[PDB]
Symmetry: C3
Subunit: 103 residues, 3 copies
């Protein structure tokens, strides 16, 4: 089964580095980067807003744990946003390519 992983990085340099690392290690098949986003959350009763690059990574269930572990390790921040969403269907050729890319 395939999955989508949502992760954020603090800047473009970091997003590139993260993607390059996990792609080289064959922990993900592909990564989409979307710069120019904003993340909002509370920290110690204050509304914080930070620039982020949204990442959308594609991998398989077999690799999801290892991918999260690698992203967490290489990410500069302590507790980065790392979430896995299930893929229930898709283009047969794409999903095969995704799986083959991690062999």
């Amino acid at each position: 089964a395939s999955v989508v992983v949502l992760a954020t990085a603090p800047d473009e340099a970091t997003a590139q580095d993260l993607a390059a690392k996990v792609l080289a290690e064959k922990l993900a098949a592909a990564a989409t980067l979307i710069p120019g986003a904003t993340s909002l959350y509370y920290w110690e009763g204050k509304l914080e807003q930070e620039y982020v690059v949204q990442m959308i990574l594609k991998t398989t269930v077999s690799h999801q744990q290892a991918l999260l572990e690698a992203l967490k390790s290489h990410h500069p921040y302590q507790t980065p946003e790392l979430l896995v969403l299930p893929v229930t269907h898709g283009d047969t050729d794409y999903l095969s390519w995704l799986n083959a890319s991690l062999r």
Copy 2:
């Protein structure tokens, strides 16, 4: 961590950054979501009475838990200027445990 409620992602669109900021700030302050990502500069296409509408929107990605999702959807609906707001819940099947713990802690 046994005390964590399962997490979900909510995809919501807002018509502009003004509204996106307002929606996010309100639901975060009301502890109905833990975090929101805003992605401006998007376009939404859809038909309305035979017309292909093309509107500029902000894509929001909100994080919350399954126990809070309904209250979040209702708050977003109330605060959203539009009558038929695009608000969708996606399941999170796995995540980093520390992040999920923080997500839960933020709502409690």
Copy 3:
């Protein structure tokens, strides 16, 4: 029930064309186009990076197959990134409208 389809297109014109076609055919209710993204993946041992428009289309489980096939047919690429994610819940009026809009 409802689903979202995550699809990428190589440019705005193509994303607009794809969305316009599947909306006219009532295979999707709506499409969000997010420009200013890139996609990273390995090809022939080399890290590639290409500009993409990220699409998020909304449809029902009843139409997802026809939607994937239509997107595949109209997409310029041989192996297009087309992925389906499940929607568990959503705005009641929105979901009603989504269902009503389809063929």
